[PDB]
Design an enzyme around this catalytic site. Structure first.
Site, mmCIF file in Angstrom:
data_model
loop_
_atom_site.group_PDB
_atom_site.id
_atom_site.type_symbol
_atom_site.label_atom_id
_atom_site.label_comp_id
_atom_site.label_asym_id
_atom_site.label_seq_id
_atom_site.Cartn_x
_atom_site.Cartn_y
_atom_site.Cartn_z
ATOM 1 C CG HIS A 11 27.833 39.904 10.514
ATOM 2 N ND1 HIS A 11 28.699 39.997 11.585
ATOM 3 C CD2 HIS A 11 26.617 39.624 11.038
ATOM 4 C CE1 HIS A 11 28.033 39.788 12.708
ATOM 5 N NE2 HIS A 11 26.768 39.560 12.406
ATOM 6 N N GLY A 57 25.102 39.532 23.498
ATOM 7 C CA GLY A 57 25.732 40.451 22.568
ATOM 8 C C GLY A 57 24.992 40.478 21.244
ATOM 9 C CG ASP A 63 31.992 40.726 11.080
ATOM 10 O OD1 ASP A 63 31.470 41.449 10.210
ATOM 11 O OD2 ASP A 63 31.329 40.099 11.944
ATOM 12 C CB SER A 87 25.080 41.018 14.833
ATOM 13 O OG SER A 87 25.026 39.616 14.564
ATOM 14 N N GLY A 88 27.655 42.836 16.061
ATOM 15 C CA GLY A 88 28.327 44.117 16.078
ATOM 16 C C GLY A 88 28.482 44.745 17.450
#
EC number: 3.4.21.1
Lengths: 241, 241
Positions: B57, B189, B102, B191-192
């Site tokens: 995403h 955190g 994801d 994203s990813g």
């Protein structure tokens, strides 16, 4: 473009709660984006027989499929066109964190066959002014994310970006536009679905669904990619491809 | 892999509120994904000198850049490596609506140069069991989305998917894993970004940040792509490319 062969019927119920069911085929540019297994994950709008416009955050790939002419996702009996995607053109300025410049073009492998129920929305020109307070319409199957399987519609007013910041703060960028907070939810719009305004007898794509209230609140507006800010990139892309 | 040349120091403050600042360079697989203008929008993890793993995403493209060896995003004085991306491999099973599967792999145009501050996290094997209750660590600059510019860390427990559904309901799929709700936020955190657990002296990538509490609540767990469910696809991709 922008003149449905089947005219939409918008009643007072389109302005409150979760809007109302559309007349079948009266939003003929509305398409559904499905994955290779048939799962509906986004909306989009036909802009001609070869091109669909949607949101970049949909992350569409060439293994996804454009479905045109649909009214009832639960019916396997109505006439629809499943159209393969030849190539995906994501706006290079898209930012997955801010969700700004949230527009992607899909070039179809074979043209859609336009009909009474399948035809194109009009694109604005970059300089078009769609004033705050204008009543516009969002359509989609977005309520199925949270319920009716048939295409829904809602009438809701455009906001100025300044008033939209009262709800969404610094999330709102110049390439966005907001609509709603008038007693109706924006949640019937699928991600990448249309926000259209009728000017001079033709429905024109003013917004592309980016995000909305996480609770589908009737007092929080939806946020859309502002098509006037992105239509020059759309036309450059069509002309180069 | 998984053995930082600079050992992490995790104190009791990593377990509460918004965690704590990391020791510089002690999470040497942690990278930042920046757009072509230098704007940080996602995290990721080096798995060798040529490959970074991140969330699908994030929508990374080959015009984005991997930044390795970073500690302070506000400092232009520390040694970092800006690495061009040759090719993006998004897992074909990714669904932008459910955010399941994801995971995306980035192949670098030129190898990172591994060092004390730049090296690889270990990947699990598909059959590894990381039990609910295990204390794991998430790192990133995610708090800058809402504030410290330096890399943060938090210690938080894995949940069973059944208990995670108490918070997130039917959003939780088999290819997801949750961690937190123990009095600390998951919002540091990116994203990813990585969720790592230490087994047998080596830090192993158990999760990739997918989404968390919209208010960074200390009682709502973060949701991560479950790397054990996706590592076979990672290895097939590396072997084919």
């Amino acid at each position: 473009c922008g003149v449905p062969a089947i005219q939409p019927v918008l009643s007072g119920l389109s302005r409150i709660v979760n809007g109302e069911e559309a007349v079948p085929g009266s939003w003929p540019w509305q398409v559904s984006l499905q994955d290779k297994t048939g799962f509906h994950f986004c909306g989009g709008s036909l802009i001609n027989e070869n091109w669909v416009v949607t949101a970049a955050h949909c992350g569409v790939t060439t293994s996804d499929v454009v479905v045109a002419g649909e009214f009832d996702q639960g019916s396997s009996s109505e006439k629809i066109q499943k159209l393969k995607i030849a190539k995906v053109f994501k706006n290079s300025k898209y930012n997955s964190l801010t969700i700004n410049n949230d527009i992607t073009l899909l070039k179809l492998s074979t043209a859609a066959s336009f009909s009474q129920t399948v035809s194109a929305v009009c694109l604005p020109s970059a300089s078009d002014d769609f004033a705050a307070g204008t009543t516009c319409v969002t359509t989609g199957w977005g309520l199925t994310r949270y319920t009716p399987d048939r295409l829904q519609q809602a009438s809701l007013p455009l906001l100025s970006n300044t008033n939209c910041k009262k709800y969404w703060g610094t999330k709102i960028k110049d390439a966005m536009i907001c609509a709603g907070a008038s007693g109706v939810s924006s949640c019937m719009g699928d991600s990448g679905g249309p926000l259209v305004c009728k000017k001079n007898g033709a429905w024109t794509l003013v917004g592309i669904v980016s995000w909305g209230s996480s609770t589908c609140s009737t007092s929080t507006p939806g946020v859309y990619a502002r098509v006037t800010a992105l239509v020059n990139w759309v036309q450059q892309t069509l002309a180069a491809n």
